[PDB]
Design an enzyme around this catalytic site. Structure first.
Site, PDB file in Angstrom:
ATOM      1  N   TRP A 167       5.044-152.294  66.526  1.00 45.25           N
ATOM      2  CA  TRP A 167       4.557-151.083  65.626  1.00 45.25           C
ATOM      3  C   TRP A 167       3.456-150.046  66.418  1.00 45.25           C
ATOM      4  CZ3 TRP A 167       3.387-153.727  60.308  1.00 45.25           C
ATOM      5  CH2 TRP A 167       4.511-154.143  59.768  1.00 45.25           C
ATOM      6  N   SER A 168       3.505-149.090  66.596  1.00 45.48           N
ATOM      7  CA  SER A 168       2.729-148.152  67.558  1.00 45.48           C
ATOM      8  C   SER A 168       2.537-146.956  66.953  1.00 45.48           C
ATOM      9  CB  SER A 168       3.052-148.420  68.820  1.00 45.48           C
ATOM     10  OG  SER A 168       4.215-147.755  69.208  1.00 45.48           O
ATOM     11  N   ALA A 170       2.723-142.900  68.267  1.00 46.74           N
ATOM     12  CA  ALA A 170       3.073-142.040  69.366  1.00 46.74           C
ATOM     13  C   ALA A 170       3.394-140.944  69.075  1.00 46.74           C
ATOM     14  CB  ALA A 170       4.202-142.664  70.318  1.00 46.74           C
ATOM     15  N   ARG A 171       3.112-139.371  69.475  1.00 46.19           N
ATOM     16  CA  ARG A 171       3.305-138.294  68.838  1.00 46.19           C
ATOM     17  C   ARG A 171       4.662-137.956  69.205  1.00 46.19           C
ATOM     18  NH1 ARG A 171       0.323-135.054  73.908  1.00 46.19           N
ATOM     19  NH2 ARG A 171       2.505-134.029  74.844  1.00 46.19           N
ATOM     20  N   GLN A 188       2.959-147.987  77.703  1.00 45.20           N
ATOM     21  CA  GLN A 188       2.829-148.310  76.018  1.00 45.20           C
ATOM     22  C   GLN A 188       4.104-149.139  75.657  1.00 45.20           C
ATOM     23  OE1 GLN A 188      -0.010-147.675  75.870  1.00 45.20           O
ATOM     24  NE2 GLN A 188      -0.276-145.706  74.279  1.00 45.20           N
ATOM     25  N   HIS A 189       3.911-149.900  74.560  1.00 44.12           N
ATOM     26  CA  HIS A 189       4.801-151.023  74.293  1.00 44.12           C
ATOM     27  C   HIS A 189       6.267-150.179  73.743  1.00 44.12           C
ATOM     28  CE1 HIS A 189       1.844-154.417  73.839  1.00 44.12           C
ATOM     29  NE2 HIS A 189       2.132-154.219  74.998  1.00 44.12           N
ATOM     30  N   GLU A 231       3.259-156.767  65.566  1.00 41.74           N
ATOM     31  CA  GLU A 231       2.093-156.361  64.987  1.00 41.74           C
ATOM     32  C   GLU A 231       2.137-156.923  63.589  1.00 41.74           C
ATOM     33  OE1 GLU A 231       3.390-154.441  67.678  1.00 41.74           O
ATOM     34  OE2 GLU A 231       1.641-153.721  68.730  1.00 41.74           O
ATOM     35  N   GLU A 280      -4.816-132.414  72.248  1.00 41.05           N
ATOM     36  CA  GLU A 280      -4.666-133.660  72.502  1.00 41.05           C
ATOM     37  C   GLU A 280      -6.256-134.115  72.276  1.00 41.05           C
ATOM     38  OE1 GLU A 280      -6.574-133.503  75.190  1.00 41.05           O
ATOM     39  OE2 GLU A 280      -5.570-135.245  75.907  1.00 41.05           O
TER      40      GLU A 280
HETATM   41  C1  LIG Z   1      -3.970-140.161  65.864  1.00 38.21           C
HETATM   42  C2  LIG Z   1      -3.108-140.943  67.047  1.00 38.21           C
HETATM   43  C3  LIG Z   1      -2.433-140.584  67.904  1.00 38.21           C
HETATM   44  C4  LIG Z   1      -1.977-141.168  69.187  1.00 38.21           C
HETATM   45  N1  LIG Z   1      -1.005-140.679  69.709  1.00 38.21           N
HETATM   46  C5  LIG Z   1      -0.419-141.088  71.009  1.00 38.21           C
HETATM   47  C6  LIG Z   1       0.589-140.717  71.794  1.00 38.21           C
HETATM   48  O1  LIG Z   1       1.046-139.555  71.589  1.00 38.21           O
HETATM   49  N2  LIG Z   1       1.274-141.551  72.711  1.00 38.21           N
HETATM   50  C7  LIG Z   1       0.966-142.771  72.710  1.00 38.21           C
HETATM   51  O2  LIG Z   1       1.397-143.590  73.670  1.00 38.21           O
HETATM   52  N3  LIG Z   1      -0.307-143.312  71.965  1.00 38.21           N
HETATM   53  C8  LIG Z   1      -0.789-142.477  71.161  1.00 38.21           C
HETATM   54  N4  LIG Z   1      -1.701-143.172  70.222  1.00 38.21           N
HETATM   55  C9  LIG Z   1      -2.318-144.355  70.763  1.00 38.21           C
HETATM   56  C10 LIG Z   1      -1.556-145.726  70.696  1.00 38.21           C
HETATM   57  O3  LIG Z   1      -1.355-145.706  69.222  1.00 38.21           O
HETATM   58  C11 LIG Z   1      -2.291-146.906  71.202  1.00 38.21           C
HETATM   59  O4  LIG Z   1      -2.464-146.944  72.586  1.00 38.21           O
HETATM   60  C12 LIG Z   1      -1.513-148.030  70.760  1.00 38.21           C
HETATM   61  O5  LIG Z   1      -2.240-149.433  71.254  1.00 38.21           O
HETATM   62  C13 LIG Z   1       0.036-148.181  71.268  1.00 38.21           C
HETATM   63  O6  LIG Z   1       0.441-149.421  70.779  1.00 38.21           O
HETATM   64  P1  LIG Z   1       1.154-150.447  71.559  1.00 38.21           P
HETATM   65  O7  LIG Z   1      -0.045-151.474  72.082  1.00 38.21           O
HETATM   66  O8  LIG Z   1       1.927-151.470  70.468  1.00 38.21           O
HETATM   67  O9  LIG Z   1       1.868-149.597  72.748  1.00 38.21           O
HETATM   68  C14 LIG Z   1      -2.184-142.455  69.226  1.00 38.21           C
HETATM   69  C15 LIG Z   1      -3.238-143.090  68.421  1.00 38.21           C
HETATM   70  C16 LIG Z   1      -3.632-142.404  67.291  1.00 38.21           C
HETATM   71  C17 LIG Z   1      -4.760-142.980  66.498  1.00 38.21           C
HETATM   72  O1  LIG Z   2      -1.598-136.323  71.922  1.00 38.75           O
HETATM   73  C1  LIG Z   2      -2.423-136.860  72.262  1.00 38.75           C
HETATM   74  O2  LIG Z   2      -3.566-136.757  71.772  1.00 38.75           O
HETATM   75  C2  LIG Z   2      -2.465-138.446  72.812  1.00 38.75           C
HETATM   76  C3  LIG Z   2      -1.478-138.918  73.709  1.00 38.75           C
HETATM   77  C4  LIG Z   2      -1.656-140.131  74.283  1.00 38.75           C
HETATM   78  C5  LIG Z   2      -0.825-141.032  75.160  1.00 38.75           C
HETATM   79  C6  LIG Z   2      -1.323-142.378  75.363  1.00 38.75           C
HETATM   80  C7  LIG Z   2      -2.343-142.935  74.675  1.00 38.75           C
HETATM   81  C8  LIG Z   2      -3.027-142.124  73.798  1.00 38.75           C
HETATM   82  C9  LIG Z   2      -2.752-140.832  73.330  1.00 38.75           C
HETATM   83  S1  LIG Z   2      -3.711-139.521  72.500  1.00 38.75           S
HETATM   84  K   LIG Z   3       0.045-151.432  68.503  1.00 36.46           K
HETATM   85 MN   LIG Z   4       2.340-153.554  70.685  1.00 39.48          MN
END
Ligand SMILES: Cc1cc2nc3c(=O)[nH]c(=O)nc-3n(C[C@H](O)[C@H](O)[C@H](O)COP(=O)(O)O)c2cc1C
Ligand SMILES: O=C(O)c1cc2ccccc2s1
Ligand SMILES: [K+]
Ligand SMILES: [Mn+2]
Ligand SMILES: Cc1cc2nc3c(=O)[nH]c(=O)nc-3n(C[C@H](O)[C@H](O)[C@H](O)COP(=O)(O)O)c2cc1C
Ligand SMILES: O=C(O)c1cc2ccccc2s1
Ligand SMILES: [K+]
Ligand SMILES: [K+]
Ligand SMILES: [K+]
Ligand SMILES: [Mn+2]
Lengths: 497, 497
Positions: A167-168, A170-171, A188-189, A231, A280
């Site tokens: 569970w994660s 990502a935009r 990223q996972h 998760e 971002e």
């Molecule tokens: C509002 C918000 C936006 C996010 N956007 C992204 C993103 O676009 N891409 C991304 O890889 N992580 C993004 N993250 C961060 C991931 O959720 C974070 O790195 C997380 O550890 C990913 O889960 P994983 O450890 O299971 O891969 C965002 C988190 C938040 C709170």
């Molecule tokens: O669009 C954004 O703000 C972000 C993209 C990503 C990619 C990876 C980890 C955090 C973020 S935060």
């Molecule tokens: K996570």
């Molecule tokens: Mn994970």
């Protein structure tokens, strides 16, 4: 009904009761207006906006909650929205919130419970009944390359062998009537699992995206818990309760039973589409900077009656990209350091650093027993953190002694500015993975994906040998206790505020 | 009465009328209590304390004013104490204060006017009538190595040839009944002049130390105006009025006629004594760190009836060591850059950096016309500033484009953290004079007096070529004007604060 940390609808009712919600019942445009209100809230630490009347809402899709994990104005309950994600008192400290998030790391998982139905099944739309371009998906920033449906939902993907369900957050943005594009990037996972399916080569990745999930589950979604850890079971151990999930209608993944909105479909192992640009976490958008992103196919939508879509209007301080991405990375870095026998007590990503730094508080009694040096210790800390996924987003580590509260950005900046000699007290890391979203990386002078990382030693020389050899020139440390108390007791009597 | 900027007694009356003063009429101990009150004021931006009843005051010596150049609580008149030094409206911006301080740099001096007497001659004590250990000299910090009589007075020394009369602040403490010790270090003008007298070898340096001087004169005292420039004529040009000075009784130097307290005597070209430790501008004291300092002999004291001694209780944010040392160094660096044909519009030392950084705002239209690169431009800026006296106290320079307000530390930290790639976008300077008071220098891992300086380029690559290629993800820049105004107009109607 169900508790606020386990049910998004109950979490919205908890923000109302807290007087931490503004319900906007008049029409609001998802084209910029909702996100502009939300952005102003985040920049001023105001109440969370709940848009109950969105221009374009059709057949219950959808209301919007902005700023779901942003800060409150008061210092006494500054982190109360985050505490409401976790069943903590709204006065909880950041140390308490991060300790809660880490508590499951040495517990047996509590696997989820399957239930036959739940509120997320109240309504459904098949492949002939929805069009993602006809929903009130927000335009969050005026130069965004698409309408970003996905800023605070949970992607659900599973390893081909079924052993790991991730569970994660990502935009993702709307590509056409039945596709999204989004960021799927290493380490990223979601990307690690995508690669497992691409090397198997047989099919597209079964996928779901759940919005308005249990708040405790969206926090773990934002946290870099270890590779291969599901998760759902970590959230179960952290909360002391097994999460209730229901099966998807069109695939065999499971979604939280009270999810406000569920998309079911596939993440392609072969197709890409235009993604971005997007306003971002560091505070920037590069207009016309369109890249290719992952492409998701949506086969079905299910949703709660009167469904609520959470939305992060991210950018400059302070929003969910700071309060959750920074702080939860710092928590996992704290734990990673301790597991590598480094004498780190606390970690936090200072907001002032746009959460690109992490301050590491050192137990200097332990450090002294190591009989080491700044260059050796900096090297060891950087190698541990910058070669691990938990360090991905972090470009500067600041080592500080026992007197610094790393949760106080003023005290981190003071220590950094006064105790770390530029160059000499630092080690640069050019052969580690870099975070390309940081403008000096992806839009900078060097390789977008490599290097640009530094360990800055704000330990003073005697902290490695015999102990701190200074007192602060401040009210707390440069005056004896009896005098300080006299001054505080006489303050108003003398004429001060 | 006489105007507040030209007469310290009138400046104290101006702080009263502003409601920016607390008069404490009950007994206060100069042993720590006065400085503890003052320290608490500086840490909370409260009203300036005037101690009218100091335990140990004998024959009119002396009252104390604390926090004479510290900040006010409001943002609207944050710098009003500094504005009261200069005849500026109390709502003055830092840009306006620094432009006032720089205004005399391209004016003919207005030399001072000699008058036969003034209030500073109301009382006198000869070599048989005073004992500096019997006056209520404050102990400012509990571990100080002496009672620091001198934190906000003006040293007056003149070149052997009489062509240059320097006014500056440098700390000094009481050594015995008729001597001080203090810091006289390169490249400071008091030290430059001391060296001229030592190479002549004939006598000790005629000296005076004037406390409660004209506020416009204490500001120039704190400013690194150029070598060989007599501060009296620069203050005269800046204020549009010739300062009135009276001759010393025991030497041929001249002191401001309304000086509250004047010490007359000599700065030795041969003797030293124990000086320090002292709670200093970066926020530190190293207890038992006693060094040898310059030794001053006091032959006479003259003073006003009901004399007031100004006092800085310096250390952690925010006091005169930040608001005047940092800001006035930044102003002279701005001017030095412009005189070297560098396209710098503004400079400020961020308080968050403990005034060890200066942020330089670049006119990027001019920069583009230079057709240069980050490495070349960083090198050129550092060579100009770090090889000049105006750069002495500053260890990091941050170059920022036109969108950054360098007077807003939040915006400097944002630009630094997001636009400067550690290592690659920086140039280290190891063969320049270092500021040993910074703990990472004098108590650090490297040479106390050399190197440890850095230019950090927070210009983005396109700012050197074709122009800024981003918009901020903030309310101001990511929403059109009509929408922003609608949101502001409807804010309270919707339910926000
Ligand atoms: C509002 C918000 C936006 C996010 N956007 C992204 C993103 O676009 N891409 C991304 O890889 N992580 C993004 N993250 C961060 C991931 O959720 C974070 O790195 C997380 O550890 C990913 O889960 P994983 O450890 O299971 O891969 C965002 C988190 C938040 C709170
Ligand atoms: O669009 C954004 O703000 C972000 C993209 C990503 C990619 C990876 C980890 C955090 C973020 S935060
Ligand atoms: K996570
Ligand atoms: Mn994970
Ligand atoms: C409260 C205060 C304390 C100061 N203490 C010292 C000090 O002990 N020694 C010193 O060389 N400069 C000190 N300064 C700074 C100098 O006044 C500043 O560097 C100035 O440029 C010196 O004058 P000059 O350019 O004529 O040498 C202090 C300034 C302030 C505002
Ligand atoms: O004691 C202190 O705070 C200071 C000593 C010095 C020396 C040189 C310039 C500024 C300062 S500020
Ligand atoms: K250090
Ligand atoms: K000066
Ligand atoms: K740069
Ligand atoms: Mn000078």
């Amino acid at each position: 009904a169900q508790p606020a940390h386990l049910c998004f609808r109950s979490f919205v009712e908890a923000l109302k009761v807290d007087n931490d919600l503004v319900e906007i019942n008049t029409p609001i445009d998802p084209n910029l207006e909702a996100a502009a209100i939300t952005r102003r809230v985040c920049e001023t630490n105001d109440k969370a906006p709940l848009f109950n009347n969105l221009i374009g809402m059709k057949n219950g899709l959808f209301r919007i909650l902005g700023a779901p994990g942003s800060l409150r104005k008061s210092s006494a309950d500054r982190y109360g929205r985050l505490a409401r994600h976790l069943a903590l008192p709204p006065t909880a400290s950041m140390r308490e919130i991060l300790d809660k998030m880490l508590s499951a790391s040495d517990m047996p998982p509590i696997p989820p419970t399957i239930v036959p139905t739940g509120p997320c099944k109240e309504n459904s739309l098949d492949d002939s009944e929805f069009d993602l371009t006809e929903l009130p998906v927000p335009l969050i920033h005026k130069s965004d390359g698409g309408k970003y449906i996905q800023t605070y939902g949970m992607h659900i993907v599973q390893s081909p062998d079924g052993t790991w369900t991730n569970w994660s957050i990502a935009r993702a943005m709307v590509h056409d009537k039945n596709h999204l594009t989004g960021l799927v990037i290493p380490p990223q996972h979601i990307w690690q699992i995508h690669q497992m399916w691409k090397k198997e080569g047989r099919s597209d990745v079964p996928w779901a995206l759940a919005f308005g999930v249990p708040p405790a589950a969206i926090m773990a979604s934002s946290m870099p818990i270890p590779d291969g850890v599901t998760e759902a079971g970590y959230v179960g151990a952290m909360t002391g309760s097994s999460l209730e999930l229901v099966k998807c209608d069109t695939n065999d993944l499971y979604v939280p039973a009270t999810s406000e909105i569920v998309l079911e479909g596939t993440l392609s192992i072969s197709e890409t589409g235009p993604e971005g640009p997007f306003g971002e976490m560091h505070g920037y958008i590069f207009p016309g900077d369109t890249h290719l992103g992952a492409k998701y196919k949506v086969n079905r939508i299910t949703y709660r009656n009167n469904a609520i879509m959470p939305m992060s209007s991210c950018g400059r301080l302070t929003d969910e990209t700071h309060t959750m991405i920074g702080s939860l990375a710092a928590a996992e870095i704290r734990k990673l350091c301790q597991q590598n026998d480094l004498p780190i007590t606390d970690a936090f990503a200072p907001f002032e650093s746009q959460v690109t730094w992490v301050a590491l508080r050192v137990d200097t009694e332990k450090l002294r027993a190591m009989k080491t040096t700044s260059e050796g210790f900096r090297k060891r800390v950087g190698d541990v953190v910058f070669n691990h996924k938990a360090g991905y987003t972090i470009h500067r580590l600041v080592l500080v002694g026992d007197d610094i509260d790393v949760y106080e950005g003023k005290d981190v900046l003071w220590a950094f500015s006064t105790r770390c000699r530029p160059g000499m007290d630092e080690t640069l890391f050019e052969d580690v993975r870099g975070f390309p979203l940081i403008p000096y990386m992806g839009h900078g002078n060097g390789p977008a994906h490599r290097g640009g990382k530094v360990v800055s030693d704000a330990l003073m020389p005697t902290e490695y040998t015999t102990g701190r050899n200074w007192e602060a020139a401040d009210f707390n440390q440069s005056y004896p206790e009896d005098l300080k108390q006299k001054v505080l007791d006489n303050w108003t009597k003398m004429g001060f505020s």
